[PDB]
Enzyme design. Sequence first.
Site, PDB file in Angstrom:
ATOM      1  N   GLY A  50      -0.298  -6.031   5.466  1.00 33.18           N
ATOM      2  CA  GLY A  50       0.098  -4.836   5.047  1.00 33.18           C
ATOM      3  C   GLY A  50       1.080  -4.036   5.907  1.00 33.18           C
TER       4      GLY A  50
ATOM      5  N   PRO B 130      -4.757 -14.317  13.325  1.00 29.93           N
ATOM      6  CA  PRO B 130      -4.313 -15.066  12.213  1.00 29.93           C
ATOM      7  C   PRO B 130      -4.497 -16.352  12.182  1.00 29.93           C
ATOM      8  CG  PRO B 130      -2.544 -13.478  12.797  1.00 29.93           C
ATOM      9  CD  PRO B 130      -3.587 -13.524  13.782  1.00 29.93           C
TER      10      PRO B 130
ATOM     11  N   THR C 105     -18.452   0.147 -17.983  1.00 29.94           N
ATOM     12  CA  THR C 105     -17.473   0.678 -17.499  1.00 29.94           C
ATOM     13  C   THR C 105     -16.631  -0.033 -16.754  1.00 29.94           C
ATOM     14  OG1 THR C 105     -18.256   3.032 -17.204  1.00 29.94           O
ATOM     15  CG2 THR C 105     -16.345   2.612 -15.886  1.00 29.94           C
TER      16      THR C 105
ATOM     17  N   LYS D  61     -11.559  -2.496  -6.233  1.00 31.76           N
ATOM     18  CA  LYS D  61     -12.856  -2.305  -5.787  1.00 31.76           C
ATOM     19  C   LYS D  61     -13.987  -1.829  -6.769  1.00 31.76           C
ATOM     20  CE  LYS D  61     -11.409  -2.596  -0.808  1.00 31.76           C
ATOM     21  NZ  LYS D  61     -10.093  -2.446  -1.083  1.00 31.76           N
TER      22      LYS D  61
ATOM     23  N   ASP E 152       0.813  -1.208  -0.023  1.00 37.65           N
ATOM     24  CA  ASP E 152      -0.079   0.108   0.030  1.00 37.65           C
ATOM     25  C   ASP E 152       0.823   1.319   0.059  1.00 37.65           C
ATOM     26  OD1 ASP E 152      -2.554  -1.833   2.117  1.00 37.65           O
ATOM     27  OD2 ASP E 152      -2.578  -1.409  -0.207  1.00 37.65           O
TER      28      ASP E 152
END
Lengths: 212, 212
Positions: free
Chosen positions: B191, B178, B75, B68, B16
């Site tokens: 991330g 996790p 489109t 997303k 990111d």
Amino acid sequence: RVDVMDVMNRLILAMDLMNRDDALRVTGEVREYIDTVKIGYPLVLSEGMDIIAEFRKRFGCRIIADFKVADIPETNEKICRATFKAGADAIIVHGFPGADSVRACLNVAEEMGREVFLLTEMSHPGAEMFIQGAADEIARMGVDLGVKNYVGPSTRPERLSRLREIIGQDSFLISPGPGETLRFADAIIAGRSIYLADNPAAAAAGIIESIK
Amino acid sequence: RVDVMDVMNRLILAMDLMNRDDALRVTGEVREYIDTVKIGYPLVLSEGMDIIAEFRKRFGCRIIADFKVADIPETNEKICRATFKAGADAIIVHGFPGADSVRACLNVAEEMGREVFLLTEMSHPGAEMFIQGAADEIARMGVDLGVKNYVGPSTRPERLSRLREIIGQDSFLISPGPGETLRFADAIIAGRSIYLADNPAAAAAGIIESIK
């Protein structure tokens, strides 16, 4: 109203062509009729975000980034920042992810002196499943947060009057394009009707005539 | 399951960072631990879609485009096409816009031999307003359309179990990381835990140790 954007001839060009040469060519020819161009991901992903600054320099137009921003707040913030740094005057954001995601965009818009449009509804067939039912609440959410600019569909005049009721008379509302629509929307958006015409300048001029 | 992707060590890197040098530097170091990287708009809008091909070439990794996607069908088709042409192996698409918008993505994925992940839910506070209530129906919509790959939030184990119930045991599910998450998700996404660490290769190695 003085505090919302002035869109030339109440007509926004939706420049949805994905190649830079065609987009620039079709557009250059209508800058006499239009000063506000909406660009989306198909063009920007194909040709690069630099194309935003290119439009602004070549045509002196306002750019609305139709990015339908729909992520978590932290990611929304970053998308808005990158988009405004690229020169976009405004950005269109989904409301369905909720208030914090919208507020994230508003924050960056305030910081950088740009505009956020809240997309309240959509008109494609699948919109009935989840979007249509949320539209009024999404619009009210925007109003409650002081959002000034809205995007709403025009395939239903009675939908536009309802939106306009919610957002009030001062808010800025844009919708697809037209005579009926502009009773409620401040500007209409034209895409194919213009950019696929042999004489885009003619196609634009025509629409504006029917607008008077 | 043979017909869905194998993610190395069940760990996806969410890259990111918005700067190309940082992104490439952090990533290279973990290619030993991860073979699947998720890239979003912050990086691609900042550095260009060419960065997708660059990741694949430098690291030999699979790229999931976390875009997303949330537009009308026509489109969506174009966004998916541009994204897959840039080399993305998969793309994440919102279900809130409905079945036709999802199918548009599926069509292009079919044509080009790539994958679509349906985002069923989100975990940021604003998700409660509209997304949470739509989540199960969105998941069922995906199943009814033969969607094989899903993105689901991990902030609630019991939410994962419900999603897994809907999509069945054959579907591929990814979620943030996790230990209990992987009882339901096929892979977890990490991330900041990795990319903001002094030794990303170390932070990664550690997560994988917990995964045993």
